[PDB]
Ligand binder design. Structure first.
Ligand SMILES: CC(=O)N[C@@H]1[C@@H](O)[C@H](O[C@@H]2O[C@H](CO)[C@H](O)[C@H](O[C@]3(C(=O)O)C[C@H](O)[C@@H](NC(C)=O)[C@H]([C@H](O)[C@H](O)CO)O3)[C@H]2O)[C@@H](CO)O[C@H]1O
Ligand SMILES: CC(=O)N[C@@H]1[C@@H](O)[C@H](O[C@@H]2O[C@H](CO)[C@H](O)[C@H](O[C@]3(C(=O)O)C[C@H](O)[C@@H](NC(C)=O)[C@H]([C@H](O)[C@H](O)CO)O3)[C@H]2O)[C@@H](CO)O[C@H]1O
Ligand SMILES: CC(=O)N[C@@H]1[C@@H](O)[C@H](O[C@@H]2O[C@H](CO)[C@H](O)[C@H](O[C@]3(C(=O)O)C[C@H](O)[C@@H](NC(C)=O)[C@H]([C@H](O)[C@H](O)CO)O3)[C@H]2O)[C@@H](CO)O[C@H]1O
Ligand SMILES: *[C@@H]1O[C@H](CO)[C@@H](O)[C@H](O)[C@H]1NC(C)=O
Ligand SMILES: *[C@@H]1O[C@H](CO)[C@@H](O)[C@H](O)[C@H]1NC(C)=O
Ligand SMILES: *[C@@H]1O[C@H](CO)[C@@H](O)[C@H](O)[C@H]1NC(C)=O
Lengths: 170, 316, 316, 170, 316, 170
């Protein structure tokens, strides 16, 4: 992917994350937990579905027979027909090959960026209270109980409350 | 003390392709190219006609195979391999063109042209067209000299289409297996069958001569056709070897013809057809039959093309 | 105390489509599919010929409708629906092929073939071709027996093209409405019109017989053509039913033919034409007429496809 | 968009920003101002125009009549012609549909990244003197008069001048 | 005290195009559209037949030019401009269709039809077909009346294909330069050549008349063909002007025909051919010849399209 | 490019970097050095090659003659053939034009992001010991000998060792 998240700093993925696509994993006094982020999971899912709806396409264009399977048409007109169809099959075979490879490239990069976005968002919340471990985690320089972790996960964490203390642990 | 950001992963991801890499593993992917058949003609919602033994062009001339369908009505016309447009051996000139017209005709409604023949035989027949023994095409009249070798009085016939849609006229030229039987049926001397109207403009001469024994006969019947416009008037000038028509055909509405070798099914709904059945899919592409008809997925060479629906998979 | 980074937005953005989403609002978008007509043929810069009553194929044989254009010169050839290639009823064999050649011919320059006829009538005419009463095609000669029923002396004519471009030769076969008038015009006995050269190789026999009364006549004239190569030499062997030519046609340069029902306009400049006028657009696609000709935008099914020219719109 | 700017941290856009595409909005002692950044506005505009010039394309390829509207051609050759044209109309209808949806996807993502770039650039200027509010703004930990704001906007802001003071307001 | 992150750059980058910009400089780019020729037919790996003086259709009838190839075997068939299908002037009806069949035939294996002619001359010849003086086509028999003007006894011939593949039958109609020499060769009275089978159904009449002097002759020979099915049986009824065949042709396997004006080369390997040689490329597109055949890059209008293989170049 | 690296903060490229695509340039006590990063160089190269392998495509589809160069076919069937081929040449000429412009756009953006990724990675290593110069360099607030530089380049640099000192040089 183009955003360095998946197969980047986050050295790998979590097979235990069955709740959703993206999630948090924290380690504190009371232990360790793992919970998924619905908002970002849905964001990625909605965009993949958006690809699906548009690619499950029906043309109202009806094509009928110009060939005959039981009584072969005249050789010259049949060769032109066979040549035309072959040249068009080549076009749609190309289009399909390119379309999928392009969308796949976009899908990977898209989910890659949704993760990075989320990582950037948590980073903006903690502000001065934490620092980057370099593996996709934040080392919190105060004490973070399960309710503290939850406040970070559900976007209600206030950083001023722990600012003085966290900065003190320079 | 620390909180981490992460994404899900699996032990067994599926390989897909990108612009940059081949076989890169993702979490979940879906098929984009259809290969799933349905070994029947899904005809639910459509009024279907299975011609079977009857050849599509035969519905206009009416050999015994097609007595069933002399005035059929269809949304979906199905041709079969065992179909024959003919009882007494012969072809259709511009056959496939006429075949293509009839496939979308919606069906055919016939109407009498009303010809009256004096001084000649009219009831020609053959062992090839069997109903109760020897007979002939149900829509044609085998005009014959009143007796053996008796001269065929130079005649002229006429017919004006008065309907709002044009009229399909079909006649035939009988080529005898020899000059002996030719005169035996139409008298001696040369024969000519000219046909005139507004659009059309041509003529025909029989060609007596020996041929292979197709269906017991050495002779052949050249079936020709034309499209007669509203207010226009066909004109048949002849003196032998002429297979006159009794009825002109009119196209009912709109249909779609296919060629298949699988049974019908009025229980499943369908839109894309081919020789081996019906393709019912939501996928944009198919790899079943390049000559599929109706509203179909685009035919592509590839057997499979996987569209990723998940992220890049990095196992634990 | 604080400084912010931001982007503009509007209250009324326009909806466009992406790979990922349908109807996502952006700031500004532009149309990519053209629907704007111009109800005239924009002919400025081009030398245009409006055939009107004259049919394109008629410029070679010259019925009264086409006396105007027997030697036209054009960059842009316009056919009209009321055009007729004919005065005395008849078709052209391989008509549309010849029509396609003439559309790009640039015009036609005629040249006399110089035939001299002895012992026969030459000045045949008809009430169908009206100039000052009965007349005939301006480029053809209705060779007639010297009197009623008098035998038509078996003749042969010849003509060698000596120019660097090939020569379009056109002749006709007269089919009479009966055997009575056929002999009345060319004497009794069968008739044959064979035509030879290097490339070409064929023959023709008249077909007398009754037909519909198209333009007062029962008879027809089969117009045939061929392309005579440099240094080559046409040869006409005949003894009746032959509509000889007086002049051979030569293609001037390069043009482009269209079929329209709207007036010309030498004030607007154009390049893409169709039956309803001119398509002057910068957009890559059009949704006006699939059969548009010239240098045109690509025809697409969609009525509109909007290309975003602004960012994603997030209102305040 | 793929860069989390538009419809991301910057909760929304500014209907008051008529000067350009991107801009600054500051709040200080003398009050509050809003001025657009020409350089980034032009960058985005130049790339959208670049899309326009290439997509307003003229082919020198001339196509002539193979059909006839007044006198219908022979049925078989006419059906092949009608079938060929229909199959090609399907191709260009697809190409056009895909082209626009792809460029639109790129245009959104492009403008999205130009904003983010600018945000990153200001961030590099202030260095230690400010911190992220999480909504696309920087909280300056010194006093920033209108000439100070201007120095940030026109890229001449020196951070050493206020470094000692700004760090002091820890 | 400080560490920097950077990317390489050059003084002379190459310009490429993007969605957003024209002529943006990158580090390294590669060509995507091929223009490189090879002025020979790279035939290594394939069994090649260079017809040269011989015309492809001539391998079936066998004029002196084609004695070399009456039963050729090829993977790659090469036609030359100086090729002629004919010694005595004449065309082939449906020539290009038959040409297209022979190009992929793999070659032709002939087999005698075994006709025996009594009461007539059989050894017709001409100064046009030269071997040791006057001769004729090696596969055909110029059936001639036993002497000058002697009546041609109405004959019938027959031939049944018994092989598993269908049989290409070829006959000819001789059109004389006059009615004088026509009777001189086949006696007086009209002539007819009808041909019958299962599939096929037609007839032919000679057309005597004067023509240009092509190759010393005024007369022509109309070559016609048909495909005879397994178990089927051709039938030739005639009484003059008939150029009977001696041998029927059978298609060997599979080949591919091209038309070129450059020498062969059994040292280079090739797959894409055109008139000017061979296109051996890995690139997806070519700008050499739109009518290239075999397995070829896609033809595009553009002379060059550069795919960047390096990053955006920002000099120092 | 869409990632602001190439033609962005890094004001330009290094013509002296012949070792690889990306690299480091440091200035310390012992002087100044310049060495390339193999890992990132190979990453970009592998993706460009991946584009190459897929675009150097061979179709097993064989097309034969429907035209004739020495004896022109019948005018009507020849015009249909000429019209069909012309319409398809237009399609592949479009496809080729779009394909290259699209891949080129992707190639630029791709290499642009690989640089940025690397810059972000070094940033995660130094943590609190350095700060952004705004031109793609890090100002290290301790003393970094050639072995110290190497430890950063080969990803073995420990930041705790210099943390106390580097933070002291506030
Ligand atoms: C062995 C051989 O080559 N002999 C052929 C021979 O096949 C053919 O004879 C025909 O034989 C069939 C049955 O096999 C019929 O009996 C044909 O008779 C009929 C017919 O049914 O078609 C009788 C019928 O009464 C006739 N109808 C009319 C209106 O005349 C028709 C009709 O005359 C002809 O079929 C028209 O061609 O014939 C019988 O002819 C003969 C045919 O001449 O040719 C031998 O060479
Ligand atoms: C009612 C009916 O079916 N009767 C037709 C009848 O229409 C047709 O007669 C023709 O009538 C038209 C006018 O309606 C002309 O008077 C035709 O006369 C001419 C002509 O102008 O074409 C006279 C002219 O002098 C002739 N020119 C020459 C060179 O001979 C032509 C010419 O002979 C013929 O047109 C060639 O076919 O005829 C008049 O014929 C007759 C035609 O035979 O047929 C009835 O059945
Ligand atoms: C000047 C002019 O217009 N006169 C033509 C004249 O060209 C042509 O005569 C032919 O001349 C050629 C040589 O130039 C031959 O001598 C033709 O003779 C042969 C031939 O070789 O083709 C002799 C041969 O024995 C004949 N073979 C048989 C089986 O009969 C053939 C054959 O009869 C005819 O070629 C078939 O058409 O002719 C010689 O004919 C004459 C032809 O009639 O026409 C003048 O108008
Ligand atoms: C056209 O292609 C089909 C197979 O796709 C083949 O069966 C048929 O014979 C071909 N027709 C001609 C005239 O080559
Ligand atoms: C071809 O299509 C046009 C409409 O696009 C129609 O009017 C015409 O009749 C069609 N021709 C044939 C032969 O079906
Ligand atoms: C078809 O195109 C070729 C050039 O591509 C030209 O030489 C030929 O004459 C054309 N055929 C017809 C019938 O226009």
């Amino acid at each position: 992917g183009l955003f360095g998240a998946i197969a980047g700093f986050i050295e790998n993925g979590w097979e235990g994350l069955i709740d959703g696509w993206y999630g948090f994993r924290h380690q504190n006094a009371q232990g360790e937990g793992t919970a998924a982020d619905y908002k970002s999971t849905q964001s990625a899912i909605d965009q993949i579905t958006g690809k699906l709806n548009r690619l499950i396409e029906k043309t109202n264009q009806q094509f009928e027979l110009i060939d005959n399977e039981f009584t072969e048409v005249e050789k010259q007109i049949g060769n032109v027909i066979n040549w035309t169809r072959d040249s068009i099959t080549e076009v749609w075979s190309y289009n399909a090959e390119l379309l999928v490879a392009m969308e796949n490239q976009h899908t990977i990069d898209l989910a890659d960026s949704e993760m990075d976005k989320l990582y950037e968002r948590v980073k903006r919340q903690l502000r001065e209270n934490a620092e980057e471990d370099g593996t996709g985690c934040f080392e919190i320089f105060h004490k973070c109980d399960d309710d503290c972790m939850a406040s970070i996960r559900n976007n209600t964490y206030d950083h001023s409350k722990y600012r003085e203390e966290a900065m003190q642990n320079r | 003390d620390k909180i981490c950001l992460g994404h899900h992963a699996v032990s067994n991801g599926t390989k897909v392709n990108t612009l940059t890499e081949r076989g890169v593993e993702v979490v979940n992917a879906t098929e984009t190219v259809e290969r799933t058949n349905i070994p029947r003609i899904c005809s639910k919602g459509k009024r279907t006609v299975d011609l079977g033994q009857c050849g599509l062009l035969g519905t206009i001339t009416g050999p015994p195979q097609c007595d069933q369908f002399l005035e059929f009505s269809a949304d979906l016309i199905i041709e079969r391999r065992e179909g024959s447009d003919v009882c007494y051996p012969g072809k259709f000139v511009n056959e496939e063109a006429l075949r293509q017209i009839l496939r979308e005709s919606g069906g055919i409604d016939k109407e009498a042209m009303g010809f009256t023949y004096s001084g000649i035989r009219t009831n020609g027949a053959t062992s090839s067209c069997r109903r109760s023994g020897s007979s002939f095409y149900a829509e044609m009249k085998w005009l014959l000299s009143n007796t053996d070798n008796a001269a065929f009085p130079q005649m002229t016939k006429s017919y004006k289409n008065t309907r709002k849609n044009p009229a399909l006229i079909v006649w035939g030229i009988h080529h005898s297996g020899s000059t002996a039987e030719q005169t035996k049926l139409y008298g001696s001397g040369n024969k000519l069958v000219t046909v005139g109207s507004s659009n059309y403009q041509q003529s025909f001469v029989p060609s007596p001569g020996a041929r292979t024994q197709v269906n017991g006969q050495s002779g052949r019947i050249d079936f020709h056709w034309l499209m007669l416009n509203p207010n226009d008037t066909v004109t048949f000038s002849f003196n032998g070897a002429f297979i006159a028509p009794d009825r002109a055909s009119f196209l009912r509405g709109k249909s779609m013809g296919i060629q298949s070798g699988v049974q019908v099914d009025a229980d499943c709904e369908g839109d894309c057809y081919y020789s081996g059945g019906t393709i019912i899919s939501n996928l944009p592409f198919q790899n079943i039959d390049s000559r599929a008809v109706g509203k179909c997925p685009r035919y592509v060479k590839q057997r499979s093309l996987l569209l990723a629906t998940g992220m890049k998979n990095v196992p634990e």
